Tab-separated table of C-alpha atoms in Angstrom:
chain	number	residue	atom	x	y	z
A	1	UNK	CA	-47.777	12.621	-59.580
A	2	UNK	CA	-49.012	14.662	-62.619
A	3	UNK	CA	-47.774	14.721	-66.244
A	4	UNK	CA	-46.267	17.941	-67.754
A	5	UNK	CA	-47.310	16.780	-71.263
A	6	UNK	CA	-50.185	18.388	-73.186
A	7	UNK	CA	-53.073	15.996	-72.323
A	8	UNK	CA	-56.876	16.202	-71.875
A	9	UNK	CA	-58.758	15.622	-68.605
A	10	UNK	CA	-62.014	14.643	-70.312
A	11	UNK	CA	-62.388	12.763	-73.638
A	12	UNK	CA	-65.724	12.681	-75.474
A	13	UNK	CA	-66.348	9.911	-77.995
A	14	UNK	CA	-69.112	10.140	-80.595
A	15	UNK	CA	-70.582	6.792	-81.783
A	16	UNK	CA	-68.691	5.040	-84.582
A	17	UNK	CA	-72.028	3.218	-85.215
A	18	UNK	CA	-75.704	3.575	-84.045
A	19	UNK	CA	-79.124	2.007	-84.592
A	20	UNK	CA	-82.317	3.942	-83.732
A	21	UNK	CA	-85.405	1.528	-83.851
A	22	UNK	CA	-89.099	0.990	-82.933
A	23	UNK	CA	-88.452	0.512	-79.170
A	24	UNK	CA	-84.651	0.745	-78.694
A	25	UNK	CA	-81.543	2.796	-79.497
A	26	UNK	CA	-78.072	1.150	-79.874
A	27	UNK	CA	-74.591	2.798	-80.071
A	28	UNK	CA	-70.873	1.720	-80.377
A	29	UNK	CA	-67.856	3.695	-79.160
A	30	UNK	CA	-64.104	3.087	-79.664
A	31	UNK	CA	-62.991	3.708	-76.067
A	32	UNK	CA	-59.342	4.302	-76.850
A	33	UNK	CA	-57.429	4.250	-73.533
A	34	UNK	CA	-54.268	5.845	-74.878
A	35	UNK	CA	-50.735	4.887	-73.821
A	36	UNK	CA	-49.226	5.920	-70.449
A	37	UNK	CA	-52.793	6.457	-69.027
A	38	UNK	CA	-55.342	4.460	-66.972
A	39	UNK	CA	-59.127	4.894	-67.062
A	40	UNK	CA	-61.411	4.266	-64.112
A	41	UNK	CA	-64.743	3.143	-65.582
A	42	UNK	CA	-66.498	5.044	-62.726
A	43	UNK	CA	-65.497	8.156	-64.711
A	44	UNK	CA	-67.487	6.946	-67.715
A	45	UNK	CA	-71.121	7.779	-68.616
A	46	UNK	CA	-73.424	8.222	-71.661
A	47	UNK	CA	-74.400	11.866	-72.329
A	48	UNK	CA	-77.807	11.444	-74.034
A	49	UNK	CA	-79.595	14.417	-75.708
A	50	UNK	CA	-83.119	14.182	-77.188
B	1	UNK	CA	-105.895	-3.492	-105.383
B	2	UNK	CA	-106.508	-0.866	-108.067
B	3	UNK	CA	-107.018	2.909	-107.866
B	4	UNK	CA	-109.507	2.620	-104.917
B	5	UNK	CA	-107.362	0.179	-102.880
B	6	UNK	CA	-108.371	0.202	-99.190
B	7	UNK	CA	-105.830	0.984	-96.391
B	8	UNK	CA	-104.164	-2.260	-95.482
B	9	UNK	CA	-102.092	-4.380	-92.988
B	10	UNK	CA	-99.965	-7.499	-93.453
B	11	UNK	CA	-100.125	-10.969	-91.889
B	12	UNK	CA	-97.066	-13.323	-92.159
B	13	UNK	CA	-97.188	-17.020	-91.115
B	14	UNK	CA	-95.910	-20.482	-92.061
B	15	UNK	CA	-96.582	-24.245	-91.968
B	16	UNK	CA	-94.555	-27.371	-91.813
B	17	UNK	CA	-96.523	-30.369	-90.747
B	18	UNK	CA	-94.956	-33.825	-91.485
B	19	UNK	CA	-91.964	-32.487	-89.462
B	20	UNK	CA	-91.487	-32.611	-85.707
B	21	UNK	CA	-89.202	-29.951	-84.239
B	22	UNK	CA	-85.614	-30.980	-83.342
B	23	UNK	CA	-82.921	-29.615	-80.978
B	24	UNK	CA	-79.582	-31.526	-81.089
B	25	UNK	CA	-77.722	-31.734	-77.773
B	26	UNK	CA	-74.470	-30.874	-79.658
B	27	UNK	CA	-71.874	-28.107	-78.968
B	28	UNK	CA	-72.752	-26.597	-82.316
B	29	UNK	CA	-76.063	-27.878	-83.713
B	30	UNK	CA	-74.587	-30.068	-86.564
B	31	UNK	CA	-74.681	-33.829	-86.880
B	32	UNK	CA	-70.975	-34.677	-86.458
B	33	UNK	CA	-71.863	-38.278	-85.398
B	34	UNK	CA	-74.688	-40.190	-83.648
B	35	UNK	CA	-72.976	-39.909	-80.211
B	36	UNK	CA	-72.609	-36.130	-79.847
B	37	UNK	CA	-69.761	-34.208	-78.178
B	38	UNK	CA	-71.887	-32.899	-75.275
B	39	UNK	CA	-73.198	-36.460	-74.805
B	40	UNK	CA	-69.592	-37.423	-74.116
B	41	UNK	CA	-68.856	-34.369	-71.849
B	42	UNK	CA	-71.781	-35.601	-69.640
B	43	UNK	CA	-69.999	-38.991	-69.230
B	44	UNK	CA	-66.731	-37.412	-67.933
B	45	UNK	CA	-68.853	-34.957	-65.902
B	46	UNK	CA	-69.768	-37.955	-63.567
B	47	UNK	CA	-72.635	-35.916	-61.962
B	48	UNK	CA	-76.435	-35.809	-61.947
B	49	UNK	CA	-78.326	-32.833	-63.425
B	50	UNK	CA	-82.036	-31.878	-63.367
C	1	UNK	CA	-90.250	-15.084	-59.641
C	2	UNK	CA	-92.952	-17.693	-58.914
C	3	UNK	CA	-96.574	-16.889	-59.828
C	4	UNK	CA	-99.222	-16.738	-57.116
C	5	UNK	CA	-102.639	-17.060	-58.854
C	6	UNK	CA	-105.356	-14.503	-57.859
C	7	UNK	CA	-106.801	-15.419	-54.394
C	8	UNK	CA	-104.290	-18.254	-53.836
C	9	UNK	CA	-103.222	-18.425	-50.140
C	10	UNK	CA	-100.501	-21.042	-50.596
C	11	UNK	CA	-97.370	-21.163	-52.836
C	12	UNK	CA	-95.262	-24.384	-52.729
C	13	UNK	CA	-91.981	-24.336	-54.694
C	14	UNK	CA	-88.983	-26.657	-54.997
C	15	UNK	CA	-85.575	-26.929	-56.613
C	16	UNK	CA	-84.262	-30.376	-57.501
C	17	UNK	CA	-81.105	-31.947	-55.974
C	18	UNK	CA	-78.018	-29.662	-56.457
C	19	UNK	CA	-74.957	-28.509	-54.454
C	20	UNK	CA	-75.185	-25.745	-51.797
C	21	UNK	CA	-71.545	-25.006	-51.140
C	22	UNK	CA	-71.083	-21.326	-50.192
C	23	UNK	CA	-74.874	-20.690	-50.028
C	24	UNK	CA	-75.733	-17.554	-47.965
C	25	UNK	CA	-79.481	-17.717	-47.218
C	26	UNK	CA	-82.835	-16.498	-48.592
C	27	UNK	CA	-84.378	-13.116	-49.173
C	28	UNK	CA	-87.999	-12.869	-50.302
C	29	UNK	CA	-90.882	-10.404	-50.956
C	30	UNK	CA	-94.199	-10.169	-52.898
C	31	UNK	CA	-94.886	-8.264	-56.176
C	32	UNK	CA	-97.946	-7.520	-58.336
C	33	UNK	CA	-97.913	-9.079	-61.802
C	34	UNK	CA	-98.958	-5.836	-63.507
C	35	UNK	CA	-96.221	-3.986	-61.568
C	36	UNK	CA	-93.456	-6.357	-62.971
C	37	UNK	CA	-92.086	-6.157	-66.559
C	38	UNK	CA	-90.583	-9.167	-68.370
C	39	UNK	CA	-86.793	-8.605	-68.823
C	40	UNK	CA	-86.369	-11.586	-71.220
C	41	UNK	CA	-87.545	-9.481	-74.232
C	42	UNK	CA	-86.672	-6.186	-76.004
C	43	UNK	CA	-90.234	-5.043	-75.398
C	44	UNK	CA	-93.148	-6.368	-73.234
C	45	UNK	CA	-96.542	-5.525	-74.832
C	46	UNK	CA	-98.392	-6.639	-71.674
C	47	UNK	CA	-96.509	-4.181	-69.410
C	48	UNK	CA	-99.478	-1.763	-69.401
C	49	UNK	CA	-98.311	0.215	-66.274
C	50	UNK	CA	-95.854	3.067	-65.452
D	1	UNK	CA	-109.091	-40.405	-88.272
D	2	UNK	CA	-105.236	-40.461	-88.609
D	3	UNK	CA	-103.306	-40.914	-85.338
D	4	UNK	CA	-100.276	-38.612	-85.804
D	5	UNK	CA	-98.661	-39.813	-82.549
D	6	UNK	CA	-98.707	-43.360	-83.913
D	7	UNK	CA	-98.098	-42.925	-87.680
D	8	UNK	CA	-96.072	-39.678	-88.135
D	9	UNK	CA	-98.794	-37.626	-89.826
D	10	UNK	CA	-98.095	-34.500	-87.732
D	11	UNK	CA	-99.428	-30.978	-88.195
D	12	UNK	CA	-99.999	-28.216	-85.554
D	13	UNK	CA	-96.208	-27.430	-85.242
D	14	UNK	CA	-96.824	-23.795	-86.256
D	15	UNK	CA	-98.562	-23.443	-82.868
D	16	UNK	CA	-95.205	-23.360	-80.939
D	17	UNK	CA	-93.836	-19.858	-80.089
D	18	UNK	CA	-90.633	-20.428	-78.062
D	19	UNK	CA	-88.722	-22.973	-75.974
D	20	UNK	CA	-86.470	-22.252	-72.996
D	21	UNK	CA	-84.256	-24.998	-71.587
D	22	UNK	CA	-82.519	-24.833	-68.177
D	23	UNK	CA	-80.465	-27.511	-66.405
D	24	UNK	CA	-80.477	-27.649	-62.579
D	25	UNK	CA	-81.376	-23.996	-62.161
D	26	UNK	CA	-79.499	-20.977	-63.620
D	27	UNK	CA	-77.788	-23.091	-66.321
D	28	UNK	CA	-79.680	-21.906	-69.438
D	29	UNK	CA	-78.701	-24.663	-71.795
D	30	UNK	CA	-78.674	-23.365	-75.377
D	31	UNK	CA	-75.261	-21.895	-74.820
D	32	UNK	CA	-72.983	-18.937	-74.087
D	33	UNK	CA	-74.344	-15.795	-75.876
D	34	UNK	CA	-74.972	-18.102	-78.911
D	35	UNK	CA	-78.349	-17.229	-80.426
D	36	UNK	CA	-79.690	-13.740	-81.242
D	37	UNK	CA	-81.868	-14.311	-78.076
D	38	UNK	CA	-79.188	-16.374	-76.290
D	39	UNK	CA	-81.233	-18.477	-73.833
D	40	UNK	CA	-84.560	-19.062	-75.631
D	41	UNK	CA	-85.284	-20.823	-78.885
D	42	UNK	CA	-87.781	-18.213	-80.048
D	43	UNK	CA	-89.453	-20.131	-82.932
D	44	UNK	CA	-91.508	-17.148	-84.215
D	45	UNK	CA	-92.076	-13.421	-83.455
D	46	UNK	CA	-95.353	-11.450	-83.255
D	47	UNK	CA	-93.283	-8.195	-82.853
D	48	UNK	CA	-89.735	-7.905	-84.222
D	49	UNK	CA	-88.152	-4.417	-84.053
E	1	UNK	CA	-125.808	26.347	-73.601
E	2	UNK	CA	-128.926	26.373	-71.319
E	3	UNK	CA	-130.230	27.611	-67.971
E	4	UNK	CA	-129.641	24.243	-66.288
E	5	UNK	CA	-126.133	23.966	-67.841
E	6	UNK	CA	-125.190	27.156	-65.837
E	7	UNK	CA	-125.213	24.600	-62.973
E	8	UNK	CA	-122.396	22.443	-64.318
E	9	UNK	CA	-119.522	22.203	-61.785
E	10	UNK	CA	-115.877	21.224	-62.206
E	11	UNK	CA	-113.156	19.474	-60.245
E	12	UNK	CA	-109.423	19.902	-61.031
E	13	UNK	CA	-107.641	17.085	-62.874
E	14	UNK	CA	-105.626	14.633	-60.737
E	15	UNK	CA	-101.911	15.440	-60.356
E	16	UNK	CA	-99.673	13.206	-62.445
E	17	UNK	CA	-95.993	13.972	-62.224
E	18	UNK	CA	-93.945	12.323	-65.013
E	19	UNK	CA	-90.166	12.060	-65.099
E	20	UNK	CA	-87.215	9.729	-65.393
E	21	UNK	CA	-86.842	7.011	-62.744
E	22	UNK	CA	-84.436	7.141	-59.822
E	23	UNK	CA	-80.807	6.680	-60.979
E	24	UNK	CA	-82.274	6.341	-64.536
E	25	UNK	CA	-83.338	2.723	-63.709
E	26	UNK	CA	-85.050	1.121	-66.724
E	27	UNK	CA	-83.261	3.351	-69.338
E	28	UNK	CA	-80.419	0.874	-70.145
E	29	UNK	CA	-80.769	-2.911	-70.788
E	30	UNK	CA	-79.187	-5.134	-68.135
E	31	UNK	CA	-79.738	-8.819	-67.350
E	32	UNK	CA	-81.281	-9.206	-70.788
E	33	UNK	CA	-79.085	-11.367	-72.940
E	34	UNK	CA	-80.894	-10.665	-76.307
E	35	UNK	CA	-79.826	-7.018	-75.958
E	36	UNK	CA	-76.646	-7.367	-73.905
E	37	UNK	CA	-74.069	-4.541	-73.660
E	38	UNK	CA	-70.481	-5.068	-74.986
E	39	UNK	CA	-67.021	-4.308	-73.694
E	40	UNK	CA	-64.312	-6.032	-75.767
E	41	UNK	CA	-60.683	-5.489	-76.728
E	42	UNK	CA	-61.041	-4.262	-80.378
E	43	UNK	CA	-58.524	-6.824	-81.771
E	44	UNK	CA	-59.870	-9.721	-79.659
E	45	UNK	CA	-63.536	-8.731	-80.376
E	46	UNK	CA	-64.976	-11.140	-77.671
E	47	UNK	CA	-67.427	-9.564	-75.212
E	48	UNK	CA	-66.254	-9.389	-71.572
E	49	UNK	CA	-69.772	-8.662	-70.217
E	50	UNK	CA	-71.395	-12.186	-70.004
E	51	UNK	CA	-74.639	-11.134	-68.246
E	52	UNK	CA	-77.410	-13.509	-66.955
E	53	UNK	CA	-81.257	-13.535	-66.771
E	54	UNK	CA	-81.536	-14.432	-63.035
E	55	UNK	CA	-79.389	-11.368	-62.066
E	56	UNK	CA	-80.840	-7.947	-61.151
E	57	UNK	CA	-78.274	-5.128	-61.660
E	58	UNK	CA	-80.789	-2.341	-61.123
E	59	UNK	CA	-81.906	-3.528	-57.669
E	60	UNK	CA	-78.290	-4.390	-56.844
E	61	UNK	CA	-77.305	-0.816	-57.687
E	62	UNK	CA	-80.204	0.677	-55.629
E	63	UNK	CA	-79.092	-1.359	-52.547
E	64	UNK	CA	-75.415	-0.371	-53.122
E	65	UNK	CA	-76.108	3.393	-53.001
E	66	UNK	CA	-77.947	3.107	-49.662
E	67	UNK	CA	-74.845	1.409	-48.207
E	68	UNK	CA	-72.450	3.957	-49.761
E	69	UNK	CA	-74.378	7.132	-48.890
E	70	UNK	CA	-77.504	9.018	-47.807
E	71	UNK	CA	-80.379	8.562	-50.224
E	72	UNK	CA	-82.228	11.587	-48.747
E	73	UNK	CA	-79.830	13.886	-50.662
E	74	UNK	CA	-80.915	14.465	-54.273
E	75	UNK	CA	-78.350	14.702	-57.083
E	76	UNK	CA	-79.439	15.879	-60.518
E	77	UNK	CA	-76.534	14.482	-62.562
E	78	UNK	CA	-77.405	10.829	-62.083
E	79	UNK	CA	-81.125	11.703	-61.601
E	80	UNK	CA	-80.780	10.343	-58.038
E	81	UNK	CA	-83.801	11.144	-55.880
E	82	UNK	CA	-85.195	8.063	-54.045
E	83	UNK	CA	-88.908	7.189	-54.144
E	84	UNK	CA	-90.897	7.899	-50.970
E	85	UNK	CA	-94.314	8.687	-49.517
E	86	UNK	CA	-95.539	11.004	-46.766
E	87	UNK	CA	-95.526	8.743	-43.615
E	88	UNK	CA	-98.675	10.562	-42.348
E	89	UNK	CA	-100.389	9.481	-45.648
E	90	UNK	CA	-99.316	5.800	-45.419
E	91	UNK	CA	-100.355	5.571	-41.752
E	92	UNK	CA	-103.294	8.009	-41.265
E	93	UNK	CA	-102.592	8.964	-37.584
E	94	UNK	CA	-105.947	10.778	-37.008
E	95	UNK	CA	-105.513	13.123	-33.971
E	96	UNK	CA	-108.701	15.037	-35.076
E	97	UNK	CA	-108.516	18.892	-35.299
E	98	UNK	CA	-107.934	21.884	-32.968
E	99	UNK	CA	-111.311	23.671	-33.583
F	1	UNK	CA	-84.865	-28.204	-51.397
F	2	UNK	CA	-88.612	-27.806	-50.872
F	3	UNK	CA	-90.093	-24.507	-49.657
F	4	UNK	CA	-93.701	-23.442	-48.947
F	5	UNK	CA	-95.281	-20.074	-48.087
F	6	UNK	CA	-98.688	-19.163	-46.662
F	7	UNK	CA	-99.928	-15.618	-47.554
F	8	UNK	CA	-102.947	-13.285	-47.416
F	9	UNK	CA	-105.085	-13.575	-50.611
F	10	UNK	CA	-104.840	-10.606	-53.013
F	11	UNK	CA	-107.789	-10.767	-55.512
F	12	UNK	CA	-105.221	-10.030	-58.296
F	13	UNK	CA	-102.256	-12.104	-59.643
F	14	UNK	CA	-98.960	-11.613	-57.782
F	15	UNK	CA	-95.418	-13.060	-57.826
F	16	UNK	CA	-93.356	-14.433	-54.984
F	17	UNK	CA	-89.964	-12.769	-55.506
F	18	UNK	CA	-87.412	-15.171	-54.041
F	19	UNK	CA	-83.677	-14.414	-53.970
F	20	UNK	CA	-81.325	-17.307	-53.346
F	21	UNK	CA	-78.351	-15.469	-51.813
F	22	UNK	CA	-75.044	-16.714	-53.300
F	23	UNK	CA	-71.629	-15.381	-54.236
F	24	UNK	CA	-71.579	-13.697	-57.734
F	25	UNK	CA	-67.998	-12.761	-58.505
F	26	UNK	CA	-65.749	-11.755	-61.470
F	27	UNK	CA	-61.946	-11.700	-61.874
F	28	UNK	CA	-60.563	-9.532	-64.733
F	29	UNK	CA	-57.113	-10.100	-66.289
F	30	UNK	CA	-55.570	-7.552	-68.760
F	31	UNK	CA	-52.294	-9.260	-69.860
F	32	UNK	CA	-51.518	-7.200	-73.010
F	33	UNK	CA	-52.435	-3.857	-74.690
F	34	UNK	CA	-56.152	-3.891	-75.602
F	35	UNK	CA	-56.886	-7.386	-74.135
F	36	UNK	CA	-59.566	-8.189	-71.513
F	37	UNK	CA	-60.045	-11.716	-70.166
F	38	UNK	CA	-62.902	-11.968	-67.667
F	39	UNK	CA	-63.819	-15.048	-65.575
F	40	UNK	CA	-67.217	-15.321	-63.864
F	41	UNK	CA	-68.245	-17.685	-61.075
F	42	UNK	CA	-71.597	-17.491	-59.330
F	43	UNK	CA	-71.812	-20.116	-56.574
F	44	UNK	CA	-73.996	-21.980	-55.646
F	45	UNK	CA	-76.414	-21.739	-58.673
F	46	UNK	CA	-73.361	-21.494	-60.936
F	47	UNK	CA	-74.637	-20.465	-64.377
F	48	UNK	CA	-72.110	-22.491	-66.519
F	49	UNK	CA	-71.880	-26.389	-66.774
G	1	UNK	CA	-63.896	-28.472	-82.504
G	2	UNK	CA	-66.097	-26.014	-80.529
G	3	UNK	CA	-65.100	-23.159	-78.209
G	4	UNK	CA	-66.398	-23.036	-74.645
G	5	UNK	CA	-65.843	-19.201	-74.547
G	6	UNK	CA	-68.885	-16.863	-74.685
G	7	UNK	CA	-69.358	-15.976	-78.357
G	8	UNK	CA	-72.260	-15.377	-80.850
G	9	UNK	CA	-73.189	-17.644	-83.745
G	10	UNK	CA	-74.798	-14.792	-85.769
G	11	UNK	CA	-73.471	-11.194	-85.775
G	12	UNK	CA	-75.579	-8.317	-87.038
G	13	UNK	CA	-73.821	-5.261	-88.451
G	14	UNK	CA	-75.341	-1.815	-88.963
G	15	UNK	CA	-74.552	0.800	-91.648
G	16	UNK	CA	-71.782	3.023	-90.168
G	17	UNK	CA	-72.777	5.388	-93.035
G	18	UNK	CA	-75.452	5.537	-95.793
G	19	UNK	CA	-76.158	7.821	-98.789
G	20	UNK	CA	-79.331	8.315	-100.932
G	21	UNK	CA	-80.069	9.606	-104.449
G	22	UNK	CA	-83.303	9.870	-106.541
G	23	UNK	CA	-82.738	6.286	-107.896
G	24	UNK	CA	-80.186	4.483	-105.589
G	25	UNK	CA	-78.968	3.744	-102.021
G	26	UNK	CA	-75.411	3.043	-100.721
G	27	UNK	CA	-74.426	1.728	-97.240
G	28	UNK	CA	-70.982	1.177	-95.609
G	29	UNK	CA	-70.325	-1.487	-93.026
G	30	UNK	CA	-67.280	-2.441	-90.923
G	31	UNK	CA	-67.432	-6.219	-91.244
G	32	UNK	CA	-65.232	-7.224	-88.282
G	33	UNK	CA	-63.868	-10.746	-87.802
G	34	UNK	CA	-62.323	-11.144	-84.322
G	35	UNK	CA	-58.901	-12.837	-83.749
G	36	UNK	CA	-60.232	-16.364	-83.152
G	37	UNK	CA	-63.145	-16.283	-85.711
G	38	UNK	CA	-63.146	-17.174	-89.425
G	39	UNK	CA	-66.039	-16.132	-91.691
G	40	UNK	CA	-67.203	-17.921	-94.843
G	41	UNK	CA	-68.688	-15.078	-96.915
G	42	UNK	CA	-71.407	-17.382	-98.330
G	43	UNK	CA	-73.045	-17.118	-94.886
G	44	UNK	CA	-73.345	-13.268	-95.167
G	45	UNK	CA	-76.436	-11.377	-96.547
G	46	UNK	CA	-78.039	-7.913	-96.678
G	47	UNK	CA	-81.236	-7.955	-94.608
G	48	UNK	CA	-83.392	-5.149	-95.981
G	49	UNK	CA	-86.701	-3.656	-94.677
G	50	UNK	CA	-88.958	-1.098	-96.420
């Protein structure tokens, strides 16, 4: 059921690219789902600070 | 203009007048022939559209 | 979204001939124009309401 | 005066702002994510962030 | 400053709560193909999203939550706290007063 | 299809919000590492033609 | 000739990094060409605002 390997529960990705503008903000992430894992996209969200 | 130049804002516009605007019904907008590729898809589509 | 002019008591609408295979039915309601932003643009300068 | 309709001496084209094209309903013609505003030919912009 | 201006009188300013919308609706772009979100395999580079103008993801999500749970329970993480009104303020129900 | 509605006058501009209820479905295939193929079909009012 | 998959005609890239000095500017971009694209570089240009 659970792996004995050293492996994170939560991964945090900073933008590889971003574009702050007059009326919008844009950002790109490299969502690397590593090997021998699966990601449920319901786990995912954008942690905005401002 | 000059050392007393008034605070200022910019207006950008264009003309082209002997023209009339064109939109090719073509899968990419080039002239590849007179009878375009989409014009042939709509033959083999055998259906009416509004 | 179909516009209903101020003080108009009637709103006739139509859709031209098309298929209806797997159609489920209709849901409808009424909205104010000032209480409805345009989603077709990055910004809506006439959306003067919050 | 001139009759542009009849003789090709057009002007007034700068007065268009955008065109949107839709077959049946829901089928926005221009194409699949094609243009920078995919389903309108926006000819000109008054605001352009 | 004057003897008649002693007789100015004030009224408090109208309440105006400001905050983020329920479920953060309106913060992200959806059903807006000029500004569409992207999810693509990084080698393949073709967007899997393919959104449409005559779709309404925000209303669709609002309806989904009411079918999945009880909207009367607030949840700060997603900013979930459904819009309401006092029912005695929408429908006046004037039983007078016990005086 | 023709439809018509009769409504109380508002003294301000309003919009009839009409939802044509359809199916609006996606199937997602992931055949190889880092590959997503996604297939959409709304029906009726299919949005591709 | 033309693909019927959902794909852009024009792609807009953003500086993934930028540096400034008293007399110059320097920006880095990840020009990405997907597996089924090809890019003629004569179609590329630096769109600058200031």
